[PDB]
């Protein structure tokens, strides 16, 4: 029986790999590990010299990985996604200079640019009749794997009282285990662009760019997702500015990346109801949430007292919880009439245009070759950037 051997030995393996590839307990505790006494980096060295290299290499490896993940049929990039993860946690545990953490953020941007490999792999592997049952079970393993990794990272730090250095050796036990799991993945018999079983993409783009909702939510995915990424990369440097007490027990970075995933699974679930119902007022639905993001970025830049670090965590859970609400709606309005050969090209070029904006703002605001702002004055620039973006869509919606 090959059909009963598929759901037992393959679909139970994609939901086991997709669970175990998201297990990185020290992923929420990289920046408290760098700024702690273990590596002993100064804040001025992480916000201006290490973290802007994350948004530079992510421009450099976005298009090389996206072309390679379809040409190699998604398995050696899923092998690379896991192996570059190990190269991050090796440089975190063996590197001591600033140049050994700039290389750490270069391998970390490969693991961000190969996030699409996994999901774009379940589509090319399973049959389209059984695709909704497999990818529904697979994304319920990634979202479970993202949530319970930050819980496992938090309970070892808060409850287990394990140190930050010994946490990354636990994180090297799951990342070396998920490289071996990426070896035994079934390579798909097709792909999306190169390896097909047998251009119109330039012709159907001439018909889909004239849509009002594809024009709107693509200009949201370029600019609002650029400002979203510049908060998540720098909110752990801001929490270490508010409460810089090196204790490895009062830091709840894993409890703010698990509660943001749990809220990111609630508002995502609540966005599927409003997906096609609120498509008319989507130009005002952006400005109601971008302004809410404009206040929560300012709330991060307003809290200075270390006794209110708990109010900061909640200003970031409600930030990711509000960004996750628009994306269910964003992925819909964009991918409504697009073919799969054109949908992965529109999202593949919206992410590149978002990484163009992420490269511009990091070189202007965050990098030492531009202004070189600290992370307290940097979030005041992003709160202006979200409020500038909020009054564009609010004035844009009122024109209707």
The binder of ligand GJF chosen from 6, 45, 119, 195 (CB under 6 A) = 119
Stretch that binds ligand GJF, among 157-165, 284-292, 328-336, 374-382 (CB under 6 A): 328-336
Nearest-approach distance from CB 306 to ligand GJF, in angstroms:
29
Is 135 a binding residue for ligand GJF by CB under 6 A? The answer is: yes
Place of tokens 């965590």: 313
Tell me the window of 79-87, 139-147, 245-253, 300-308 that interacts with ligand GJF (CB under 6 A). Answer: 139-147
d(CA 105, CA 101) in angstroms, rounded, equals: 6
Find out whether 313 is annotated in a ligand binding site.
no
Binding mask of the shown chain, residues 261 to 290, with x at each position contacting ligand GJF by CB under 6 A? ---x---x----------------------
Contact between 85 and ligand GJF per CB under 6 A: no
Distance from C-alpha of 225 to C-alpha of 289, rounded to nearest angstrom: 13
Both tokens of 20, joined, read 């175990």
196 is in an annotated binding site: no
The CA distance from 249 to 164, in Å, is: 10
Terminal-residue alpha carbon distance, the chain = 59
252 binds ligand GJF (CB under 6 A): no
Closest to 315 measured CA to CA, from 292, 336, 338: 292
Chain breaks in the chain (C to N over 2.5 A) after: 198
CA distance 236 to 259: 15
143 binds ligand GJF (CB under 6 A): yes
Are residues 4 and 20 in contact, defined by beta-carbon separation less than 8 angstroms? no
| In the complex, least distance from residue 132 CB atom to ligand GJF, rounded to whole angstroms | 7
Count of C-beta atoms within a 10 Å radius of residue 238: 22
Pick the binder of ligand GJF from 95, 160, 288, 328 (CB under 6 A): 328
Among 58, 85, 217, 332, which residue sits at the site for ligand GJF (rule: CB under 6 A)?
332
| Using rule CB under 6 A, residue 45 touches ligand GJF | no
- Burial class (CB within 10 angstroms; exposed 0-12, middle 13-18, buried 19+) of 374: middle
Q: Is 329 annotated as a binding residue?
A: no
Q: Is 347 in the site for ligand GJF (CB under 6 A)?
A: yes
CA pair distance 115, 77, nearest whole angstrom: 9
What residues make contact with ligand GJF under the rule CB under 6 A?
Answer: 115-116, 119-120, 123, 135, 139, 142-143, 146, 264, 268, 324, 327-328, 331-332, 335, 343-344, 347
**Residues of each annotated binding site for 2',3'-cGAMP:** 115-116, 119, 131, 139, 229, 268, 324, 328, 331, 340, 343, 347
């Amino acid at each position: 029986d090959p059909e009963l051997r598929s759901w037992r030995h393959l679909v139970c393996y994609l939901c086991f790999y997709g669970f175990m590839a998201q297990i990185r307990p020290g992923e929420s505790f990289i920046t408290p590990y760098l700024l702690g006494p273990d590596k002993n980096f100064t804040r001025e060295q992480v916000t201006n010299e290490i973290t802007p290299v994350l948004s530079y290499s992510y421009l450099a490896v976005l298009v090389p990985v996206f072309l390679l993940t379809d040409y190699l049929r998604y398995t050696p990039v899923l092998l690379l996604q896991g192996l570059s993860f190990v190269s991050v946690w090796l440089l975190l545990l063996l590197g001591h200079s600033v140049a050994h953490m700039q290389l750490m953020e270069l391998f970390y941007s490969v693991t961000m640019a190969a996030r699409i490999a996994y999901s774009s792999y379940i589509f090319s592997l399973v049959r389209p009749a059984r695709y909704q049952r497999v990818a529904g079970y697979s994304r319920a393993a990634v979202l479970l794997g993202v949530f319970t990794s930050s819980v496992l990272g938090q309970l070892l730090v808060t409850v287990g009282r394990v140190s930050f250095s010994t946490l990354n050796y636990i994180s090297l036990a799951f990342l070396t285990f998920s490289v071996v799991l990426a070896l035994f993945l079934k390579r798909p018999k097709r792909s999306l662009f190169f390896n097909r079983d047998d251009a119109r993409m330039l012709r159907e783009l001439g018909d889909s760019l004239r849509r009002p909702q594809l024009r709107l939510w693509s200009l949201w995915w370029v600019f609002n997702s650029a400002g979203y990424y510049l908060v998540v990369y720098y909110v752990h440097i801001l929490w270490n500015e508010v409460d810089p007490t090196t204790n490895s027990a009062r830091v709840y970075n894993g409890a703010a990346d698990a509660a943001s995933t749990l809220l990111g699974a609630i508002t995502s679930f609540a966005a599927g109801f409003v997906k096609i119902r609120w498509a008319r007022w989507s130009k005002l639905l952006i400005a109601g949430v971008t302004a809410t993001q404009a206040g929560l970025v300012f709330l991060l830049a307003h809290t200075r007292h270390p006794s209110s670090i708990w109010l900061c965590y909640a200003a970031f859970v409600l930030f990711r919880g509000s960004y996750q609400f628009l994306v269910p709606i964003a992925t819909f309005q964009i991918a409504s009439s697009l073919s799969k050969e054109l949908c992965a090209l529109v999202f593949g070029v919206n992410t590149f245009f978002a990484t163009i904006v992420k490269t511009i703002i990091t070189f202007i605001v965050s990098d030492v070759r531009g202004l070189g702002l600290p992370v307290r004055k940097q979030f005041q620039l992003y709160s202006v950037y979200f409020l500038i973006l909020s009054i564009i869509y609010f004035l844009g919606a009122m024109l209707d």
